[PDB]
Design a binder for this molecule. Structure first.
Ligand SMILES: Cc1cc2nc3c(=O)[nH]c(=O)nc-3n(C[C@H](O)[C@H](O)[C@H](O)COP(=O)(O)OP(=O)(O)OC[C@H]3O[C@@H](n4cnc5c(N)ncnc54)[C@H](O)[C@@H]3O)c2cc1C
Ligand SMILES: Cc1cc2nc3c(=O)[nH]c(=O)nc-3n(C[C@H](O)[C@H](O)[C@H](O)COP(=O)(O)OP(=O)(O)OC[C@H]3O[C@@H](n4cnc5c(N)ncnc54)[C@H](O)[C@@H]3O)c2cc1C
Lengths: 450, 450
């Protein structure tokens, strides 16, 4: 077909659907043109070997007020990750300690250096913010030193530095700490409300969606009916000052006044622009790259770790698997774990065969929770890197130096072309809440323009 | 044959030969009955693929005054290990730094904790001594805690503790720090004159023997002529209050007034005693075990590292190879390295094939000295563990708790049976100088008895 709308939206992940929702509410027409056979993008619930898994994003935290509002508006309810009993810490030397409380069971020197680092990061985050960290007068100094070098300059304590990196590098940006700047760490902290928020798994990994996070996108997409187009990769955006024509597979052709490119930034150059985007965009987009993390899912006859007095939460910056949590489905009698293998360690596991890789990862899970972790009934690894319409995970960030160099331009419309994804968000950066915020912000921009 | 002597000496390593030498000087007759086809025991020079190597012990330090006296008496001269230029340090994180000076190029916290640990060890060594560390009133407290636990109680700094262990555990006792006590570390330090002596490779690995250390034993054995018997494993010691009959392969039978068992203590029970030794000995001997270390020898067309401004000395407590030094032969134009792989890391390398093991070790040498270390013209690994008449290296020590429990009995004659090896020595413990001292001490004991 060919059709005419106020706004063509490329991508039906949560940012594109949030924008579509808001645009409709204010009386604008939309088409949402989506490449895959489903909506949700980096959120995806599927049944794998008889187990319902959240293959993509899943967690809701208390700072994420725009997602929490939306969940309400869609009739979605939440439940909390299980947290009773003891967590497990694996030291830099490989020693396992069960513990409770807000600090890791390390030697006192490391424990004092960690608290100091956490406080300094909280102070920087509070002063610098997530809206425009590049405009702060500290921006150039912080953005031209890697987070690894900045940590070394702050502290002689190797274990504290490794644990501080655990929460930002493997835990959030999913890139090695040598490869991103101290200002990018500060933005990551500020975006979650504080660095202390990223340290506390009871805050950042607090709740999940009954029904699964993919329902958020599914329900916004339902409300839009035939205005959503699936299995339609956008190939071409012809534009001028008055409008755009979007062309997609299946001979689709949408003529609209504005376009929202609601895709992560590494994928912008998948589309031919006619005329080309400006030099500024051609350069900036090359400096954006997603991280890499394997989300590991292991399903067992029972949550066996609870019988041992454990919450299922483990942290070990020196393990192949640096984080493991109880991810048992709501109302399920079977126990499920989720675990993460980040950046260069994800590279290293993908070099092994799937069978050696599984055994390696399960051996690491057994160091936290015991040998029963090696006998799951369903094992699955999310594999977002293989997916041409994602190509990595959780989210995209600048290379070292790119945030201060290009950050102020990362949300700017090129004439009728607008940009909206979690990867360029302020609060909620890299998460569903940031996709939602950015979709709503882009809608209000377009609305006021009209 | 059958023969009669004042003293039968079992073993022609340096302790047994030193004892034989001294006994002759005072007018006593001896036979020295040796199992292998050569003298020297744990000292052995051989030509391997056209390169002269010191397969066993080799180094002389300035504290080793009884060996230095002996070298003089035998006309042997010494030369110093090459030490010009920069050393290499590999950190707990795997970072290589070239340096000079007396301290490692670590962060300042680790550097301050190392100096403190070194001082405390020096103080304990000075107060406790190497003659009878079990008689000090601190002996029980220090001997019932492992050196690993004692270090943890002294310091929160993982890198300092690992480096302190490098000098005692992998560097000397060749057992893991969890397996021996703090009192055994203190004895090791005291035996070399101080712990600072064990830290400074320019002291403890100062000189070598022109001609090779095996010449020390060869020349004492020469002076004894036909009184040395080779290829004669001792099988049986029949004894009573008046004397002993020693029986060895080749139908040898020595009737003597006293016997010196000049073998490391793990081998005492290779010989049948008639009547059996006392309970005290039957128990004590079971608590003595040699360590394990692979002495790696790599020969190159030139000492190539000198062209890069390096001494060839490297330290890396977290590497498979923890120590590497310039071991170039005196007057040789070809460069030779010596390196060490200790205890559980030696176990781990012996589980690989000889070819994977070689490649592993050379890869580690290349982390210190660059890729040219992977292209040697002769590669050889000393393999003392396979040798039935040694079975490990450098030397034997008590299990955890054995030093205080049994140390006071470790040099006591059983009637006509005397004990003499480096492994029970005081100054020079575990080294050729301690074998020499013990041989001389045993001679003077026997002499005064007569
Ligand atoms: C393993 C993993 C776990 C995660 N866990 C969490 C979590 O616990 N909590 C949290 O908040 N967030 C989490 N996230 C992140 C969250 O999933 C993403 O931030 C959010 O989904 C991004 O939303 P988006 O709308 O900005 O982009 P996407 O979700 O990536 O949507 C982009 C959409 O555009 C489509 N598209 C791309 N190119 C084209 C084209 N040319 N033509 C047409 N369509 C196109 C894609 O197919 C896709 O549907 C996780 C992410 C991953 C990968
Ligand atoms: C790889 C390695 C490197 C070393 N480096 C150094 C160093 O650099 N500096 C240093 O001072 N020391 C070093 N040493 C230690 C030194 O070599 C030993 O401490 C010293 O050789 C021990 O002397 P011994 O006379 O006490 O025993 P040994 O040298 O072991 O002599 C024991 C002798 O008794 C024989 N024997 C055993 N059982 C019988 C039997 N039943 N019948 C007959 N004969 C028997 C053996 O064959 C052997 O010849 C090193 C040792 C090794 C293994």
């Amino acid at each position: 077909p060919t059709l005419q709308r106020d706004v063509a939206i490329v991508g039906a992940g949560p940012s594109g659907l949030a924008a579509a929702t808001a645009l409709r509410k204010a009386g604008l027409s939309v088409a949402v043109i989506e490449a895959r056979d489903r909506v949700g993008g980096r959120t995806w619930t599927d049944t794998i070997d008889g187990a319902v898994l959240e293959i993509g994003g899943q967690w809701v935290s208390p700072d994420q007020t725009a997602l929490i509002s939306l969940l309400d508006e869609l009739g979605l309810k939440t439940f909390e990750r299980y947290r009773e009993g003891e967590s497990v810490y694996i030291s830099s030397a490989g020693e396992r300690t069960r513990y409770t409380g807000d600090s890791f069971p390390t030697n006192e020197t490391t424990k004092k250096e960690m608290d100091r680092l956490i406080d300094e990061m909280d102070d920087l985050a509070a002063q610098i913010g997530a809206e425009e960290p590049w405009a702060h007068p500290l921006a150039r100094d912080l953005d031209t030193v890697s987070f690894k070098q900045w940590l070394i300059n702050q502290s002689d304590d190797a274990e504290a530095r490794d644990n501080i990196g655990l929460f930002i590098a493997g835990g959030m940006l999913t890139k090695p700490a040598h490869s991103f700047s101290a200002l990018q760490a500060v933005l990551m902290a500020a975006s979650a409300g504080s660095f202390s928020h990223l340290v506390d798994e009871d805050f950042i990994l607090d709740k999940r969606v009954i029904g699964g996070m993919q329902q958020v996108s599914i329900r916004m997409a339902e409300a839009l009916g035939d205005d959503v187009f699936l299995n339609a990769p956008v190939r071409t955006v012809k534009w001028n000052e008055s409008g755009a024509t979007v062309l997609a597979d299946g001979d689709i052709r949408v003529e609209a006044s504005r376009v929202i490119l609601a895709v992560p930034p590494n994928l912008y150059s998948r589309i031919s622009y006619d005329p080309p985007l400006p030099r500024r965009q051609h350069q900036m987009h090359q400096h954006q790259s997603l991280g890499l993390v394997i989300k590991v899912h292991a399903v067992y006859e029972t949550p066996f770790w609870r019988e041992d007095g454990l919450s299922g939460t483990g942290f070990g910056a020196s393990e192949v698997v640096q984080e493991v949590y109880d991810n048992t489905n709501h109302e399920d009698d079977r126990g499920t774990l989720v675990a993460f293998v980040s950046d260069e360690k994800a590279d290293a596991m993908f070099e092994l065969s799937a069978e050696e890789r599984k055994a390696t990862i399960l051996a690491s899970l057994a160091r936290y929770l015991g040998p029963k972790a090696e006998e799951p009934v369903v094992y699955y690894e999310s594999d977002w890197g293989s997916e041409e319409w994602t190509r990595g995970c959780y989210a995209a960030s600048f290379d070292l130096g790119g945030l201060h160099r290009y950050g102020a331009d990362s949300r700017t419309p090129v004439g009728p072309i607008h940009f909206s994804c979690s990867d360029i968000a302020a609060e909620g950066y890299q998460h569903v809440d940031g996709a939602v915020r950015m979709g709503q912000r882009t809608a209000a921009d377009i609305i006021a323009r009209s």
